[PDB]
Amino acid sequence: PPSIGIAVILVGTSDEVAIKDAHEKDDFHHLSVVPRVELVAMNETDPKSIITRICDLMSDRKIQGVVFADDTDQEAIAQILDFISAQTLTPILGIHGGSSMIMADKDESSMFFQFGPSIEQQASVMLNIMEEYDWYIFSIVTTYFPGYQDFVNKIRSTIENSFVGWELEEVLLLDMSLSKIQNQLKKLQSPIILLYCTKEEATYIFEVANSVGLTGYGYTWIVPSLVAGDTDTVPSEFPTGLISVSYDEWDYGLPARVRDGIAIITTAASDMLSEHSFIPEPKSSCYNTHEKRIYQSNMLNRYLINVTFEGRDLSFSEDGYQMHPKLVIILLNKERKWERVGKWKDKSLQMKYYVWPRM
Numbered sequence: 001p002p003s004i005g006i007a008v009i010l011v012g013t014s015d016e017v018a019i020k021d022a023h024e025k026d027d028f029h030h031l032s033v034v035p036r037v038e039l040v041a042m043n044e045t046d047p048k049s050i051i052t053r054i055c056d057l058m059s060d061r062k063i064q065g066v067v068f069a070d071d072t073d074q075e076a077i078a079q080i081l082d083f084i085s086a087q088t089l090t091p092i093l094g095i096h097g098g099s100s101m102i103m104a105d106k107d108e109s110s111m112f113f114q115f116g117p118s119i120e121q122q123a124s125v126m127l128n129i130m131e132e133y134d135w136y137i138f139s140i141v142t143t144y145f146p147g148y149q150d151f152v153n154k155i156r157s158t159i160e161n162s163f164v165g166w167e168l169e170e171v172l173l174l175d176m177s178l179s180k181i182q183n184q185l186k187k188l189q190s191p192i193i194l195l196y197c198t199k200e201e202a203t204y205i206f207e208v209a210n211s212v213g214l215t216g217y218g219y220t221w222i223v224p225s226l227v228a229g230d231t232d233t234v235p236s237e238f239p240t241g242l243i244s245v246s247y248d249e250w251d252y253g254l255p256a257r258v259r260d261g262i263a264i265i266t267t268a269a270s271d272m273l274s275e276h277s278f279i280p281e282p283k284s285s286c287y288n289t290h291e292k293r294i295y296q297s298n299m300l301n302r303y304l305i306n307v308t309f310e311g312r313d314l315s316f317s318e319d320g321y322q323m324h325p326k327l328v329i330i331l332l333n334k335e336r337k338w339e340r341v342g343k344w345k346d347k348s349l350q351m352k353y354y355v356w357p358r359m
């Protein structure tokens, strides 16, 4: 019978996932392809251990798709996953963690997809939140983290052509390497500040700003889902009164994300088998790649891109982000815990507070 080998790699998760033994030879939601899911749990959590582990695994076993989750703030994992996907022409889904943090510079040949919001979609949500409370005067601070230009250009885009009273005061670009930063942050006027950067960079940028008094009352910082990250890990240096977009497993838990990864890869193999009477072979080397099986791969990609499952639209954009994620807006409260203050689902923002709290 027709069957696709899928690997599920969970990395540093307290969260527990249980999947049918592959030996069951059991169909998955009536799809014509039968998944052979290999669960792999990882004790180790550094990028090097992960490439070593995933590559060893493609060499040793017959894998044609990879579902990957991690519980860390290590965006670097997304770089590794992209490379591997490109090298092997295998679909790789980054369903949670550092693996799903926005990666702007994806190889156009990789079939690496991330769950959650594109960089633009988050820029858009950030402006939605600000309009819902007539926060119209604001500044942007970014680092050099890839995506930063796509961030600003999306703000400037939606702002320049609209008859709302938007006013972009300053736009900063920070160099994280050495304190000539202090002099740049000191130049910040506006009460709303949009910050694009990494969790790591954020925690240092805050500490500096905390000590220029651009934190606290009268200043609101809005930040992208990667800066929140693992919401159980809150840097001492993050200011209470911090708003962030987020996708850190509030309503959509790991087992549901894994179920969904399997469905995407398995629907795609099914739809392709339907039309072309065949399915891409397993590639077995991240490195020594005789891999000019390029025509086949490209074909799969048309299908991964458009999957729909249990009524959910799981389709992906060209840049490799999820088209329609259901996001949560969160707030860093006085007890220094992240708190739900909103929701978003197909251009519909539902905020929780009537008057914005004082934190």
Ligand SMILES: *[C@@H]1O[C@H](CO)[C@@H](O)[C@H](O)[C@H]1NC(C)=O
Binding pocket: 271, 306, 308
């Ligand atoms: C993919 O999306 C298009 C356009 O919205 C749709 O019409 C098409 O039938 C989809 N394919 C599947 C298998 O749903």
Ligand SMILES: *[C@H]1O[C@H](CO)[C@@H](O)[C@H](O)[C@H]1NC(C)=O
Binding pocket: 043, 044
């Ligand atoms: C695997 O994880 C740790 C540290 O990475 C290791 O040292 C340890 O021996 C392993 N887990 C257990 C329960 O021993």
Ligand SMILES: [Cl-]
Binding pocket: 041, 042, 043, 044, 053
């Ligand atoms: Cl391991």
Ligand SMILES: [Cl-]
Binding pocket: 072, 073, 074
């Ligand atoms: Cl981490």
Ligand SMILES: [Cl-]
Binding pocket: 095, 096, 097, 100, 115, 116, 247, 248, 249
């Ligand atoms: Cl996520």
Ligand SMILES: [Cl-]
Binding pocket: 100, 101, 102, 116, 117, 224, 225, 226
């Ligand atoms: Cl993100």
Ligand SMILES: [Cl-]
Binding pocket: 118, 119, 120, 121, 150, 319
């Ligand atoms: Cl984008």
Ligand SMILES: [Cl-]
Binding pocket: 104, 145, 146, 147, 148, 149, 150
């Ligand atoms: Cl950029």
Ligand SMILES: [Cl-]
Binding pocket: 148, 149, 150, 152, 153
């Ligand atoms: Cl730019």
Ligand SMILES: [Cl-]
Binding pocket: 173, 174, 175, 176, 180, 181, 184
């Ligand atoms: Cl700088």
Ligand SMILES: [Cl-]
Binding pocket: 206, 207, 210, 236, 237
């Ligand atoms: Cl501090």
Ligand SMILES: [Cl-]
Binding pocket: 246, 247, 248, 249, 250, 251, 252, 253, 328
């Ligand atoms: Cl969620």
Ligand SMILES: [Cl-]
Binding pocket: 253, 255, 256
């Ligand atoms: Cl579930």
Ligand SMILES: [Cl-]
Binding pocket: 259
């Ligand atoms: Cl299921």
Ligand SMILES: [Cl-]
Binding pocket: 284, 285, 286, 287, 288, 289
């Ligand atoms: Cl190899």
Ligand SMILES: [Cl-]
Binding pocket: 298
């Ligand atoms: Cl082509």
